[PDB]
Each structure stands twice: as C-alpha cells, then as structure tokens.
Amino acid sequence: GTGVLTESNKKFLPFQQFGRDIADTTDAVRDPQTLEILDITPCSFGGVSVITPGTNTSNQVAVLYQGVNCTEVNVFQTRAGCLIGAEYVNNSYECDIPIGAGICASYQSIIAYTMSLGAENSVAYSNNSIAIPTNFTISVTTEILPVSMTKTSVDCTMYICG
Amino acid sequence: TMSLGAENSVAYSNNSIAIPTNFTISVTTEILPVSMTKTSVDCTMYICGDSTECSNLLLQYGSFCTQLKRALTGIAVEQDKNTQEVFAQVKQIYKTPPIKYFGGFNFSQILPDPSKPSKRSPIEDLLFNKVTQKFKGLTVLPPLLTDEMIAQYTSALLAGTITSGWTFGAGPALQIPFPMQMAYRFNGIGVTQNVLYENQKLIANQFNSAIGKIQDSLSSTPSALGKLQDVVNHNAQALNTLVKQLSSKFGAISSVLNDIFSRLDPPEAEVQIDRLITGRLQSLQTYVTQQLIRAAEIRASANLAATKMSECVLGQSKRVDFCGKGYHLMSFPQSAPHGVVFLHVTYVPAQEKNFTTAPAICHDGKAHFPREGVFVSNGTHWFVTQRNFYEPQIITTDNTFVSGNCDVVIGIVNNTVYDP
Amino acid sequence: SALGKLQDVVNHNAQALNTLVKQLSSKFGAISSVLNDIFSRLDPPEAEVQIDRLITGRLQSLQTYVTQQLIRAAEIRASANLAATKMSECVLGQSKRVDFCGKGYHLMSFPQSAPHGVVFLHVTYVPAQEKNFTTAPAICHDGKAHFPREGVFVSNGTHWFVTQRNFYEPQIITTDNTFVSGNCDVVIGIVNNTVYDP
Numbered sequence: 049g050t051g052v053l054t055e056s057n058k059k060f061l062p063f064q065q066f067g068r069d070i071a072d073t074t075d076a077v078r079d080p081q082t083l084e085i086l087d088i089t090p091c092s093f094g095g096v097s098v099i100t101p102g103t104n105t106s107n108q109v110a111v112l113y114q115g116v117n118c119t120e121v122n123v124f125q126t127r128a129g130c131l132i133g134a135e136y137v138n139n140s141y142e143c144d145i146p147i148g149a150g151i152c153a154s155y156q157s158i159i160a161y162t163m164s165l166g167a168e169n170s171v172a173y174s175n176n177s178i179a180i181p182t183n184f185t186i187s188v189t190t191e192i193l194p195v196s197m198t199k200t201s202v203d204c205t206m207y208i209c210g
Numbered sequence: 211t212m213s214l215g216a217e218n219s220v221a222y223s224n225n226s227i228a229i230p231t232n233f234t235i236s237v238t239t240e241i242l243p244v245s246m247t248k249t250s251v252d253c254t255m256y257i258c259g260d261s262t263e264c265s266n267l268l269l270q271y272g273s274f275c276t277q278l279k280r281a282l283t284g285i286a287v288e289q290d291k292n293t294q295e296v297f298a299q300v301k302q303i304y305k306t307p308p309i310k311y312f313g314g315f316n317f318s319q320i321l322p323d324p325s326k327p328s329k330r331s332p333i334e335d336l337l338f339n340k341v342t343q344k345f346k347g348l349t350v351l352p353p354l355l356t357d358e359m360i361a362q363y364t365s366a367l368l369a370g371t372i373t374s375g376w377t378f379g380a381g382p383a384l385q386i387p388f389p390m391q392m393a394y395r396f397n398g399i400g401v402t403q404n405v406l407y408e409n410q411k412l413i414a415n416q417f418n419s420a421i422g423k424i425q426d427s428l429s430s431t432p433s434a435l436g437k438l439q440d441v442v443n444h445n446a447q448a449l450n451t452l453v454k455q456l457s458s459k460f461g462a463i464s465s466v467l468n469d470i471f472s473r474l475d476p477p478e479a480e481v482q483i484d485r486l487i488t489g490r491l492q493s494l495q496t497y498v499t500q501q502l503i504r505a506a507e508i509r510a511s512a513n514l515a516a517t518k519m520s521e522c523v524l525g526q527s528k529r530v531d532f533c534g535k536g537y538h539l540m541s542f543p544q545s546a547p548h549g550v551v552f553l554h555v556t557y558v559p560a561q562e563k564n565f566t567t568a569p570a571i572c573h574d575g576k577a578h579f580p581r582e583g584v585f586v587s588n589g590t591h592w593f594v595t596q597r598n599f600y601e602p603q604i605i606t607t608d609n610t611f612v613s614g615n616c617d618v619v620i621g622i623v624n625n626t627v628y629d630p
Numbered sequence: 631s632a633l634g635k636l637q638d639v640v641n642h643n644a645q646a647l648n649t650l651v652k653q654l655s656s657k658f659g660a661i662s663s664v665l666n667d668i669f670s671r672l673d674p675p676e677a678e679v680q681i682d683r684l685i686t687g688r689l690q691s692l693q694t695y696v697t698q699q700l701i702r703a704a705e706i707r708a709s710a711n712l713a714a715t716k717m718s719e720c721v722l723g724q725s726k727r728v729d730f731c732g733k734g735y736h737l738m739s740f741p742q743s744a745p746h747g748v749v750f751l752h753v754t755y756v757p758a759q760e761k762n763f764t765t766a767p768a769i770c771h772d773g774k775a776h777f778p779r780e781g782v783f784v785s786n787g788t789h790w791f792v793t794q795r796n797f798y799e800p801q802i803i804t805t806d807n808t809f810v811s812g813n814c815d816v817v818i819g820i821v822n823n824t825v826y827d828p
C-alpha cells in the first residue's frame with residue numbers, strides 16, 4: 049500500500065493484524081518486527097480548478113486546490129481549499145466568479161473577496177407613522193423561457209454497423 | 211380495514227344558513243427541501259487508482275468520465291442556482307427597529323437572537339439541532355452560501371414582512387404600523403377591520419399561544435423533519451453503495467488490481483482488467499444517472515419553494531390551501547439544513563350558529579338585495595351581516611340595492627327596510 | 631448574455647450529438663475500431679469476440695445518450711408547462727400572484743417568439759416618491775368610531791384625510807366614505823376629529 053504512516057492510538061487485540069474502516073479499506077496496521085500500531089492515511093489529494101477572467105480580457109489565472117491545507121503544496125486559505133494567485137481584500141462586492149463558502153473572485157489583477165449580501169437599508173417603523181406613494185413608474189421587464197428542444201432521430205443499424 | 215374518516219352529515223335544508231361567531235388564529239408548518247450535497251467524482255482514483263498502466267488501458271476506452279465530470283458540475287451549479295432562486299429575492303438587507311413592540315404580538319421565537327453566537331432564532335436553532343470522512347476520489351464540494359448568509363436573508367425577509375407589510379416585495383419598502391397591516395390582511399379575506407380593532411388583545415394572545423405551541427410541537431415530534439432527513443440519508447446511502455461496489459468481484463478471479471497484475475501475465479490480466487473496469491464504469495454510470503434524477507426532483511421542489519416564498523410571504527395568496535389550511539393571512543420563513551421551513555399564519559372560523567336566511571326582501575313592490583352581506587333572522591327580526599362573521603346590522607337602504615319587482619325571485623320574504 | 635437559456639439548450643444538444651458522433655472512434659479495448667480491418671485481419675473465431683465487444687460498447691454509449699436526452703426532455707417539458715401557465719395567466723388576463731408576472735404590481739404582458747422558446751414583456755406598475763404621514767386607526771366622533779371603507783386615515787400635521795392605499799389622493803372625511811362601528815372606547819389608538827356630513 050501507499051500512504052502516510054503515522055502513530056496510531058488504536059489498540060489492536062494481540063491476534064489482530066489489520067485495521068479496517070467502514071469503507072472496508074486498510075487504515076491501521078501492526079508492525080511485524082516491533083509490535084506497534086500505525087495509522088495509514090492516503091497522501092494528500094485534491095482536484096485542481098483554474099479561475100480565469102476570460103482570455104479576451106487577459107491571461108492571468110489563479111489556481112485553487114480543493115480540500116488541501118496550504119502547507120501541503122499570494123496564497124490564501126479558504127474552506128474550499130488553498131487559493132493561490134489571488135489576493136484577499138477586506139472590501140466586499142457582488143459575487144462575480146463563485147468559489148465556495150461565501151468567497152468569490154474577480155478581475156480588477158485578480159482579487160478574492162467575501163461576497164456582499166446587499167445594500168443595508170433600515171426602515172423607520174413606528175406605531176403612528178405610515179408612508180404613502182405620491183407618484184408611480186410604469187416598468188417593463190422581460191422573461192425568457194425555453195419551450196422545445198431540437199427533435200432528433202437515430203438510425204441504429206448504420207450507427208452501430210453501417 | 212382502514213377507516214377513511216368520521217361520519218358527518220351537515221343539516222342542509224332549503225332556507226337555513228350557518229355563520230361563524232368566533233375565530234381561531236392557527237399556525238402551521240411546511241417543510242421543503244431546497245438542495246442536496248454537491249459532490250464531484252474523480253475518474254482515475256475511483257476506477258482503479260494509482261496504477262499508471264491501468265490509466266493507459268483506460269484512456270483508450272473513451273471520454274466517459276469526462277461526461278461524468280460535466281454532469282456532476284452541472285448538478286452542482288444547479289444546486290447553487292436553486293438556493294439563489296429560493297432565498298435571494300430581495301436586494302436590500304432590512305433591519306428591525308431596536309424597540310420590538312408590535313401592538314402586543316410577540317416575535318421573539320422567530321426573530322434573530324443576538325445572544326447566540328450564531329445569530330439565529332430559537333426555531334431555526336431547534337431545526338439545526340434536530341437534523342444530523344474517508345474518500346477515494348469522492349469529493350464533497352461546499353455550498354456557495356454558508357448558513358450565516360442564509361440566516362441573514364431570512365432575517366431580512368422577516369424584517370421586511372413585519373415592518374413594511376407586503377409593499378417591499380413590489381417596489382420600495384413603505385413602513386406601516388403592524389395592527390393596520392393585520393387589519394388590511396383581514397380586509398383581504400372578507401372580514402372588516404372593526405373585527406380586528408375590537409379584538410386586538412385576544413388576537414395577539416392567540417397568536418403568541420399558537421407560535422409557542424408550534425415551537426413545542428417541533429421540539430417534541432422527531433418525525434416532522436423527514437422531508438429533510440431523507441435527503442441526507444439518500445445521498446449518504448447512495449455514496450456508501452458506490453464505495454461498496456469498489457470491492458466487488460465483477461466476475462474476475464480477484465478484486466484487487468495489484469494482485470491481478472502481480473500473479474498473472476498480461477495475456478489474461480488484460481481481459482480481467484477489462485472486465486473489472488467495464489463493471490466499475492457501469493456502476494459509476496448508474497450512480498450518475500440516479501444523481502441526475504434526484505437533482506431533477508429536488509429542482510422541482512426548490513421551484514415550488516420559490517413560488518411559496520414569492521406568494522405566501524411577499525404578499526397574501528387567495529389560492530386555497532396553497533399556504534396552509536384555512537384562510538391565509540401571512541407566512542414567516544425559517545432556514546433549515548438543505549431546505550426551508552414556513553410558518554403559515556391562517557385564520558380559521560369557529561363556533562358556528564344556525565340562522566334562517568332569505569335571498570331578498572320585498573318592500574313597496576321592490577326587491578332589496580344585500581350589497582356586501584347576507585340576510586339572516588334570529589327568528590323574529592331580519593338583519594344583514596357579513597359572510598364570515600356574525601355582525602348583525604339593521605337593514606337599511608344604503609347597505610342594500612334595489613333591482614326589479616318582488617314577483618320574479620323565488621323565496622323572497624316580506625319585511626320593511628328602514629331609511630336613515 | 632440576456633438569452634443565456636436558449637443558447638444553453640442549443641449548445642447542450644449540439645455537444646451531446648458531437649460527443650455521440652466522436653464515440654465511434656473509440657477502440658473500447660479492442661485491437662481496432664474499424665469493421666473492415668478486423669474482418670480482413672482475423673478469422674471469425676476471434677473477430678466475432680472483437681465485434682461483440684465493439685457493438686456492446688457502441689450500444690451502451692448510444693443508450694447513455696438516449697437517457698440523457700430523456701432527462702433533458704423532461705426538464706424542458708416542465709419549463710414548457712410553466713411557460714403555458716404564464717401565457718394563460720399573465721397574457722390572457724391579469725395576475726394577483728406576486729412576482730409571477732414580473733416584479734411589482736402586474737398590469738399586462740405581451741409575448742414574443744424566439745428560437746426554441748418564448749419571450750414575455752411584463753408591463754408592471756411600480757410606486758415611487760413615498761412620503762411619510764401620521765396615521766390613526768379610527769376616528770372617534772360623538773362617541774362613535776368611524777372606520778374607512780377602503781382608504782386609510784392620514785394627517786399632514788393639522789388636518790385629517792382619508793386616502794387610498796397605493797396613491798396619495800387626500801379627501802375630506804365624510805359620512806359616506808366611513809362606516810360606523812361601536813363607540814370609541816375599545817379601539818386602541820383612536821383619535822378625535824369631526825366628520826363632515828354633506
């Protein structure tokens with residue numbers, strides 16, 4: 049097997065040789081020479097995602113490694129993973145490119161910020177105050193809805209054999 | 211043999227009616243899932259793992275796991291869009307006034323609690339407490355909106371629907387005192403405002419008692435949140451089944467790639483590996499299709515939840531039973547893990563009473579019809595009263611309208627009509 | 631980027647067909663992916679097995695495409711049912727459902743056709759230029775409480791009027807736009823004012 053051998057707090061019985069998890073995979077082992085219990089963890093693994101602002105605008109990119117601590121590889125640490133190539137900003141804006149756990153990045157260089165929920169607006173409420181409109185505004189909005197997709201038919205014999 | 215329900219027979223007769231003389235403010239809950247866990251699968255790790263020659267054998271098979279990655283990314287972005295549509299419906303974060311006095315109504319249970327470090331109302335905290343690793347390329351992506359932002363949207367919607375009625379959902383937010391908003395809501399369902407203004411204390415007490423009973427009932431029944439628990443259960447058990455399928459023989463001589471490689475020469479090792487990888491690809495295809503179907507169902511549920519949020523909350527809905535049993539008044543949303551919980555406040559009549567009714571009153575050869583109510587009679591006199599409440603009033607010429615002579619309608623009765 | 635949905639439909643179908651076509655050039659683990667080559671290079675005893683593997687792979691791929699098409703068709707049918715509902719309600723009438731036919735109060739809508747879809751033009755009414763006022767629930771007058779029939783009592787500071795909820799149209803409080811119900815002892819917040827009688 050392959051992994052990271054670490055000290056195990058698990059206590060095998062004297063006849064116990066292997067340890068297994070719920071997934072029925074090896075996780076704890078007993079050393080034949082010196083009778084000690086060791087853990088096995090798979091080597092740090094994760095997917096790679098590329099944040100790009102569009103090739104038309106520029107070419108700079110910031111890469112996010114999913115589910116890895118930043119110490120196991122302009123570096124930022126998020127809940128989604130380790131984010132490199134982008135700088136974290138205390139400011140807040142709307143979400144431009146989603147990342148995860150409330151973090152969104154955009155191009156201004158590349159900046160990563162916590163997404164903004166909306167404009168704060170406290171309304172003055174009191175038990176003897178009402179507000180009545182004095183004017184109006186006719187608004188026109190659009191709404192696009194797909195209806196039918198393209199009808200296709202296959203010829204099995206010619207596709208399979210020909 | 212199951213019994214459909216208790217026998218009942220309303221004493222229908224030719225000229226009798228029943229009119230409520232009392233009401234009962236009722237609060238009901240409705241639980242709706244919104245999104246499930248966003249998962250992404252890895253092709254090479256799941257199919258065999260760390261064998262480079264295995265990857266060489268796989269890459270010539272086709273671009274199947276490319277399609278699988280595409281489909282799972284589509285599902286994930288669909289989940290995020292579902293949450294956005296359900297919750298992100300207001301572009302401002304409304305904030306409740308510091309002094310929380312709304313004419314006797316007590317919103318402590320649903321308003322955010324600053325004492326808690328999580329900034330959540332007791333109801334949603336109970337919901338969170340009432341709902342309950344090792345991966346081989348099986349990644350779980352985090353949702354874009356954390357729980358705190360969802361609670362923030364819920365608080366904003368609550369503040370908007372308490373301070374400014376339903377006006378904030380159709381333009382700028384216009385403040386209005388809460389008792390007048392409630393009187394407006396009764397006037398929406400055909401009951402005049404005086405009924406509220408003469409019963410404000412009783413209505414407030416009933417509302418508080420109902421909301422307390424709802425909190426207690428959620429605290430007691432553990433099976434109420436099944437519609438949310440089963441989503442997590444389904445996802446977890448499907449993932450566990452997929453993991454278990456990894457160590458399946460699939461007709462090969464052994465279930466271990468390394469053992470097959472070591473103990474067998476390439477001639478038949480190739481055939482064994484082909485069988486194994488085909489079986490694993492088939493299992494992964496089945497899992498992906500199951501995930502797609504579940505995503506479609508959850509998206510339908512999320513669209514229904516968005517419609518409920520838009521109609522029952524942001525306004526008042528006259529659709530029957532769409533926002534709770536009884537006449538709808540207003541509803542309060544509450545956040546929940548992978549879903550949303552509504553608190554429908556509804557008006558329910560009670561304590562009906564028999565009366566003798568007539569279609570019209572003949573007087574001076576003229577037939578007087580009720581303008582907004584219904585003619586009743588306690589036995590001797592005749593009054594006109596609103597349909598949903600017993601509010602007897604002396605019949606006059608301003609709450610009735612004349613139409614034709616009194617020899618054409620059927621069942622007309624003789625009486626006088628006072629003129630002010 | 632306004633027409634994202636229809637473009638997504640077209641692109642999804644095009645890329646699905648493209649992937650299905652490109653699936654032909656896959657060996658599926660067979661020594662070749664051409665019928666004639668396997669027919670000419672090998673005799674039936676193992677060419678049969680090779681052809682079996684190839685045809686099984688191709689059928690599996692095509693069936694996967696069919697299932698994907700079925701799921702997408704179900705989604706499109708749901709969207710089309712929603713579109714039919716929107717037409718029948720917002721276009722052929724007026725809707726009291728909030729945000730169903732556009733943000734704000736709905737007035738009327740116009741349809742427009744589009745490739746593989748339909749586009750609506752929701753004409754909606756939006757209030758603006760709000761102004762605060764001091765209001766009372768009811769008016770006590772000679773021991774009788776007067777409630778508005780449809781408006782709400784407002785006051786600029788010295789005089790009281792009744793006006794409709796959605797627009798500021800002040801009116802003199804008379805006995806025809808108010809209805810009496812009981813005395814002014816039980817209503818909480820009632821104020822004092824005269825009620826003109828024509």
Ligand SMILES: *[C@@H]1O[C@H](CO)[C@@H](O[C@@H]2O[C@H](CO)[C@@H](O)[C@H](O)[C@H]2NC(C)=O)[C@H](O)[C@H]1NC(C)=O
Pocket residue numbers: 182183184185759
């Ligand atoms: C209500 O709003 C409309 C526009 O929203 C106002 O009409 C504008 O009035 C100004 C001042 O006379 C003109 O310069 C503009 O050209 C008008 N706009 C249009 C489109 O004609 C209207 O005056 C407002 N009414 C009140 C009472 O405030």
Ligand SMILES: *[C@@H]1O[C@H](CO)[C@@H](O[C@@H]2O[C@H](CO)[C@@H](O)[C@H](O)[C@H]2NC(C)=O)[C@H](O)[C@H]1NC(C)=O
Pocket residue numbers: 221564565
């Ligand atoms: C008052 O209404 C009740 C029902 O709301 C009537 O009770 C039923 O009346 C019918 C006809 O008189 C009887 O056949 C039923 O047996 C009655 N129900 C029961 C449970 O006994 C009642 O009769 C009405 N009374 C008046 C004076 O109208």
Ligand SMILES: *[C@@H]1O[C@H](CO)[C@@H](O[C@@H]2O[C@H](CO)[C@@H](O)[C@H](O)[C@H]2NC(C)=O)[C@H](O)[C@H]1NC(C)=O
Pocket residue numbers: 231232233412415416561
């Ligand atoms: C209308 O119904 C309400 C609630 O059912 C009644 O209020 C109750 O009245 C009784 C008798 O005075 C009290 O013992 C209860 O404590 C009251 N309940 C509450 C919640 O306050 C009310 O009396 C009924 N009115 C009529 C005319 O029947």
Ligand SMILES: *[C@@H]1O[C@H](CO)[C@@H](O[C@@H]2O[C@H](CO)[C@@H](O)[C@H](O)[C@H]2NC(C)=O)[C@H](O)[C@H]1NC(C)=O
Pocket residue numbers: 316317318319
């Ligand atoms: C609104 O509801 C809250 C919660 O039920 C009430 O707070 C309770 O107050 C009583 C008496 O002061 C205490 O015995 C309870 O322990 C309180 N509840 C909790 C959860 O601590 C509150 O009094 C109600 N009314 C107002 C105006 O807030």
Ligand SMILES: *[C@@H]1O[C@H](CO)[C@@H](O[C@@H]2O[C@H](CO)[C@@H](O)[C@H](O)[C@H]2NC(C)=O)[C@H](O)[C@H]1NC(C)=O
Pocket residue numbers: 588589590591
């Ligand atoms: C039906 O209601 C009317 C009006 O409430 C009653 O008429 C009055 O009833 C009160 C209470 O009994 C008496 O003090 C008045 O003298 C009655 N007025 C007249 C002109 O008679 C009537 O009694 C009620 N009928 C029944 C059968 O209850």
Ligand SMILES: *[C@@H]1O[C@H](CO)[C@@H](O[C@@H]2O[C@H](CO)[C@@H](O)[C@H](O)[C@H]2NC(C)=O)[C@H](O)[C@H]1NC(C)=O
Pocket residue numbers: 622623624
């Ligand atoms: C209501 O009153 C009218 C007039 O007072 C009644 O009409 C009379 O009915 C009697 C009985 O058949 C006739 O002899 C008269 O010729 C009728 N006069 C007119 C002008 O129509 C009527 O019958 C009464 N109906 C009820 C239900 O009391």
Ligand SMILES: *[C@@H]1O[C@H](CO)[C@@H](O[C@@H]2O[C@H](CO)[C@@H](O)[C@H](O)[C@H]2NC(C)=O)[C@H](O)[C@H]1NC(C)=O
Pocket residue numbers: 170171172173179760761762763
């Ligand atoms: C009507 O009056 C109220 C208070 O008299 C206004 O509420 C305040 O408005 C100012 C305007 O910028 C804000 O700075 C305050 O913060 C508001 N008060 C509170 C407690 O938040 C209200 O804005 C007025 N209405 C209009 C349309 O201007």
Ligand SMILES: *[C@@H]1O[C@H](CO)[C@@H](O[C@@H]2O[C@H](CO)[C@@H](O)[C@H](O)[C@H]2NC(C)=O)[C@H](O)[C@H]1NC(C)=O
Pocket residue numbers: 786787788789
């Ligand atoms: C509130 O509105 C009333 C109605 O217009 C105002 O009363 C009039 O005010 C104008 C201008 O001040 C005078 O020319 C009229 O003579 C007033 N009419 C009456 C019957 O008094 C009143 O002034 C307004 N209040 C405020 C504070 O502006």
Ligand SMILES: *[C@@H]1O[C@H](CO)[C@@H](O[C@@H]2O[C@H](CO)[C@@H](O)[C@H](O)[C@H]2NC(C)=O)[C@H](O)[C@H]1NC(C)=O
Pocket residue numbers: 770821822
């Ligand atoms: C509205 O008018 C009534 C009667 O004109 C006022 O009632 C009087 O209130 C004073 C002050 O408490 C008492 O001394 C009188 O005995 C009351 N008379 C009656 C007939 O009720 C009432 O106060 C007025 N409203 C306000 C807000 O002042």
Ligand SMILES: *[C@@H]1O[C@H](CO)[C@@H](O)[C@H](O)[C@H]1NC(C)=O
Pocket residue numbers: 174175309311313818819
């Ligand atoms: C109105 O609210 C104020 C504080 O906002 C409170 O002191 C007062 O008692 C309330 N009065 C009524 C009639 O609600």
Ligand SMILES: *[C@@H]1O[C@H](CO)[C@@H](O)[C@H](O)[C@H]1NC(C)=O
Pocket residue numbers: 223224225
């Ligand atoms: C009213 O209905 C009863 C049956 O409940 C019937 O016997 C009677 O004839 C009806 N009266 C008229 C005027 O039709």
